[PDB]
Every structure is written in C-alpha cells, then in structure tokens.
C-alpha cells in the first residue's frame, strides 16, 4: 500500500532550570506512487515516537495529485512563508529533478518526470508544506472546463 520516506528529523530544545530538555521533530512522506501523497510532521520525546506520530499524521493529510503520464498537468509556483517552490511539467526520460524535500514528496506522489526549483527561504519544513500546497492547486483541463461550463 503506502510507502514511507523520512524527509528530515531535527533535535530541537528548550532551556530549563536544570538543563536542556530535548524533543524530536520528524517530517514524513507517505504515498502509493499512484497519485496519493501525504505529509506529516510530528514531534515527541523520542525519535521513534516522533517518526511514528509523523507517519500517522501524514496518512491523515492526503492530497490527490492529478498525475498525467508521469508528470503534472501544468506549471505552478507556490509561496509558503518565506519559501517558494516551483514545479514545471516535463517529458519522459527527464527524471524527478528536485531537491530532497520536494523530491521525496513528488516520488511517492507517483511523479516520475518533473522540473523543480526552490526559491526564497529554503526551510525544509516550509518547502514541504509549499510543495503539498502546490500539488493541491494542480488542475486538469477537465476541472477547468468544469469550472467554466454553464
């Protein structure tokens, strides 16, 4: 069914009278490579607990990517926070050309050939959110037609 890729895990802290109290953050991508993708970010005292909570969260936040011959219906640019992500469709043989974060997401999304580009703040977390947001605004001629009918 779903496949899980571990995007990134950070250690994070918080000072306390007595010492630093660590916590863990994990970004998790869950997909079927069929046009079903999920992003989850969960924290917890131990890495595992985080990672697990992460996948769990991911499965609860799926996007239905309108794949189309290994690529995407059209180009979009989404700005999340100070982070900008740009997706451009590509012909076969190109591969998934993108940085780790958008990639892992795009791969499990079932995407197989895309042209990508991170702009602005390259915060993995915010870049991931933007990639997702982008995949979401993806439309098909069908959808567009449906929207402008009547």
């Amino acid at each position: 069914d779903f496949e899980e890729k571990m995007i990134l895990i950070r250690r994070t802290a918080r000072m306390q009278a007595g010492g630093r109290r660590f916590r863990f953050g994990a970004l998790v991508v869950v997909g079927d490579r069929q046009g079903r993708v999920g992003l989850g970010f969960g924290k917890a005292p131990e890495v595992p607990l985080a990672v697990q909570k992460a996948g769990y969260y991911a499965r609860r936040n799926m996007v239905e990517v309108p794949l189309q011959n290994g690529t995407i219906p059209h180009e979009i640019e989404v700005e999340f926070g100070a982070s900008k992500i740009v997706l451009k469709p590509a012909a076969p043989g190109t591969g998934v050309i993108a940085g780790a974060v958008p990639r892992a997401i795009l791969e499990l999304a079932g995407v197989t050939d895309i042209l990508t580009k991170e702009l602005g703040s390259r915060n993995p977390i915010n870049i991931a959110y933007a990639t997702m947001e982008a995949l979401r605004q993806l439309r098909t001629k069908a959808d567009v037609e449906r929207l402008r009918k009547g």
Binding site: G93, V96, I97, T112
Partner: protein, 208 residues
C-alpha cells in the same frame, strides 16, 4: 585501462548479482551465494539508511560495472543518449548494449563480458567481414558479427559456441551456431533487457 581486480566483490558491494564471469557466477560459488554482503572488515555490521546520493551512486555503479566500462566512456555515452530524441533511459541502455564487446558476449562467443573484450582485442571477432578489435566499437542494426576464420579453431571458441547449441538469443539478435555467425537485428529496448537497474536513478545521478 578497464578495472581489473577481484570482481565477485563488486557483486557483493552492489548487493545484486552481476555476472562478471561465466560458468562460475552460476556454480554454487559466486560469493553472493556464500557471503552476499559487501567486502572488507565491516561487511557484516548493520547498514545505515543510504542517503539519496548513495542510492543514485550505487545504481550508476551497478549499471556501469555490468558492462565493465570506465566512468569516462560510460559518462560520454550517457551524454549522447541524453542528447538524442527519445527516452534517455532506454536510449542509454541501447547504446551500451551496442558495444561490440557486449554483442559478442550476447552471442555466446564469449563466456563473460571481460572474455568478450579480450576476444575482440585479439582480433578473433569480425564485423561484416573486416575484423574489428575495438571493444567500444558500436554495432549497428544489420551488422553480421562472426568469429575469425583463422580463430574458428580456437579450443575456447569451440567450447563456447558448442555450449551455444540449444541456448536461445536476445530477440534483437540472431545466432547461427552453424557458421559461428551472429546478426544484430535491432537496438534492444528496456523491455528486452532485464538488468537489475533503475535507469531513472542513473539519469538523476547525473542531474545533480
């Protein structure tokens, strides 16, 4: 010059079983049958999740070590495949598969690709009559690839083309065990090949 050096160790590192030899990499020997783990002191300790790099790296290494071609040549070929019309992945495989040494290996004149290379090098192989000794020579569709009249008596070539009686040959090839001739029908497709390779990953490795 080409690699040289223990081969059934690359198999181990690459995980998959590469057939860098003949008869043996079939016997219950080719290390992958004994110790299917990478060479060296830490070959058996737990393996850490590979980085995207490692992944793409290994994949290329694998595909490349199969045809035992250098990185230089391997790369140039890739760039050519990349420049032509049509899916780079397939095309690239097609070009590698068009190397004379490979075709000689494909026709059974040689037990392994290395052996094939040496056959070509020592002029034991011929392309449409004229003899060619460039392992890198590119066989095109239509070319007849035979064994040297003079060489047709070499024990090895006898032994080999003998075992070929029976064995089938790639759908892009045709062998005439009779006169020790072979013919390059067409460029093999990705579907024709069954390499333990993820060409998508190799294409990506060069993206970076």
């Amino acid at each position: 010059g080409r690699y040289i050096g223990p081969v059934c160790r690359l198999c181990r590192r690459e995980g998959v079983k590469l057939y860098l030899k003949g008869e043996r990499c079939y016997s219950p020997k080719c290390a992958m049958e004994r110790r299917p783990y990478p060479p060296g002191q830490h070959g058996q300790k737990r393996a850490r999740r590979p980085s995207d790099y490692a992944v793409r790296l290994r994949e290329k290494q694998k595909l490349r070590r199969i045809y035992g071609i250098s990185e230089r040549q391997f790369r140039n070929l890739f760039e050519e495949a990349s420049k032509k019309k049509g899916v780079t992945g397939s095309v690239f495989l097609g070009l590698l598969e068009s190397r004379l040494d490979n075709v000689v290996y494909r026709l059974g004149f040689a037990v392994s690709r290395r052996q094939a290379r040496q056959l070509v090098r020592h002029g034991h192989i011929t392309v449409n009559g004229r003899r060619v000794d460039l392992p890198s020579y590119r066989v095109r569709p239509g070319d007849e690839i035979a064994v040297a009249e003079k060489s047709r008596n070499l024990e090895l070539i006898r032994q080999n083309l003998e075992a070929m009686k029976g064995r089938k040959v790639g759908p892009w090839l045709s062998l005439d065990v009779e006169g020790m001739k072979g013919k390059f029908l067409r460029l093999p497709d990705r579907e024709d090949l069954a390499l333990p390779v993820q060409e998508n990953l190799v294409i990506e490795f060069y993206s970076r």
